[PDB]
């Protein structure tokens, strides 16, 4: 299918995949349900990690139940519609409750039904420098994206917000502000790295679930990077090479915090930081790198 490497298309101010734009009315009119849990992230911030955690919670840590299908079918990417390939809206329409829904939409573009249904939302943020590195390699392997160009070209596009789903800065800031209006558990990738048990406990409390320590430990074990990277139900290796080419860069790439040090030159770092401070000083958000 000839659907790959196209230029992004503006949707309500945000660069999105051409086929999402083409099917935007279907996304806008998406029907949420009161018990939907929405996982909302800027790309490359821990979406798959948290989605697997949620599905594990819903299945009481049962690893085999969580291998019933690929993560992208268990937890549909709502707005992702590609002709001949996938339709997240239709996948969700046909899914029995309680649904786990994935989105990367900026808050201003989220289908209004989520607000009307007052859904609980788990937002995951990750430090910008690690995000852009992860996103660079992902652009290379995940062929729906436009060509990223060189690292320096891609870094500049990221800083300018000229990448799929728009600027990281506005995404994280506006979702942070939204936590005052709706029930949003706002998590950080770095915290999940440092103390995953603590973060899963936060998720459980938010979900109003109390589970045995033994089940919590099962969920912890199966959501580690070393397990997920080898799990074909979670590591995107069931995608066609034409869609995601693992040989270019694996989806489960490094799974650390601080990979930015391996990618950024000192000059790129200093420039990025100067720009970052200007963009983020209006926000009470604080990150670790």
Distance between CA atoms of 71 and 74, rounded to whole angstroms?
A: 5
- Measure the N-to-C terminal CA separation of the chain; round to a whole number of Å: 39
**CA angle, residues 227, 101, 39, in degrees to nearest 5:** 65
What is the footprint of ligand NPO within residues 171-190 (CB under 6 A)? none
Angle (deg, nearest 10), helices 266-280 and 168-178: 40
What is the footprint of ligand A3P within residues 33-52 (CB under 6 A)? 41, 43-49
Rg of the chain in Å (alpha carbons): 18
17 is in an annotated binding site: no
- Comparing CA positions, the residue from 237, 248, 1 lying closest to residue 141 is 248
CA distances from 80 to 137, 144, 195, 255, 257 (A): 20, 11, 31, 24, 27
Q: Is 253 in the site for ligand A3P (CB under 6 A)?
A: yes
Instruction: Write the binding mask 62 to 91 for ligand NPO: x where contact by CB under 6 A, - elsewhere.
Output: ----------x----x--x-x--xx-----
Q: Are 264 and 272 in contact (CB under 8 A)?
A: yes
Q: How far is the CB of 209 from ligand A3P (least distance, A)?
A: 20
Active-site position among 104, 145, 171, 222: 104
- DSSP type of residue 226: H
30 is in an annotated binding site: no
For ligand NPO, which is the closer residue by CB, 1 or 256?
1
- The two three-digit tokens of residue 193, written as one number: 């790295």
For ligand A3P, which is the closer residue by CB, 26 or 268?
268
What is the footprint of ligand NPO within residues 221-260 (CB under 6 A)? 239, 243-244
For ligand NPO, which is the closer residue by CB, 47 or 231?
47
33 is in an annotated binding site: no
145 in catalytic set:
no
77 is in an annotated binding site: yes
Residue ranges in contact with ligand NPO by CB under 6 A: 43, 47, 72, 77, 80, 82, 85-86, 142, 144-145, 239, 243-244
């Amino acid at each position: 299918l000839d659907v790959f490497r196209r230029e992004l298309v503006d949707v309500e101010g945000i660069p999105l995949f051409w086929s999402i734009a083409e099917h935007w009315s279907q996304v806008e009119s998406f029907e949420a349900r009161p018990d939907d849990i929405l996982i909302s992230t800027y790309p490359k911030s821990g979406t798959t990690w948290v989605s697997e955690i949620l599905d594990l919670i819903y299945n009481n840590g049962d690893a085999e139940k969580c291998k019933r299908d690929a993560i992208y079918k268990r937890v549909p990417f709502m707005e992702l519609i590609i002709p001949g390939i996938t339709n997240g809206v239709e996948m969700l329409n046909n899914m029995p409750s309680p649904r786990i829904v994935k989105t990367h939409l900026p808050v201003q573009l989220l289908p209004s039904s989520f607000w009307k249904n007052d859904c609980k939302i788990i937002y995951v943020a990750r430090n910008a420098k690690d995000v852009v590195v992860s996103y660079y390699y992902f652009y290379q392997m995940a062929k729906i994206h436009p060509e990223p160009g060189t690292w320096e070209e891609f870094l500049e596009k990221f800083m300018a917000g000229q990448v799929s789903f728009g600027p990281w800065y506005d995404h994280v800031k506006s979702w942070w502000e939204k936590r005052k209006e709706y029930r949003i558990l706002y998590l950080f990738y770095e915290d999940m790295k440092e103390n995953p048990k603590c973060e899963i406990q936060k998720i459980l409390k938010f979900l109003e679930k109390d589970i045995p320590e033994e089940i919590l430990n099962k969920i912890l074990y199966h959501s580690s990077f070393s397990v997920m990277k080898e799990n074909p139900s979670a590591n995107y290796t069931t995608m066609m090479k034409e869609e995601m080419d693992h040989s270019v860069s694996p989806f489960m790439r490094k799974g650390i915090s601080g990979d930015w040090k391996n990618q950024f030159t000192v000059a790129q770092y200093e420039k990025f930081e100067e720009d970052y401070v200007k963009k983020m000083e209006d926000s009470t958000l604080k990150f670790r790198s």
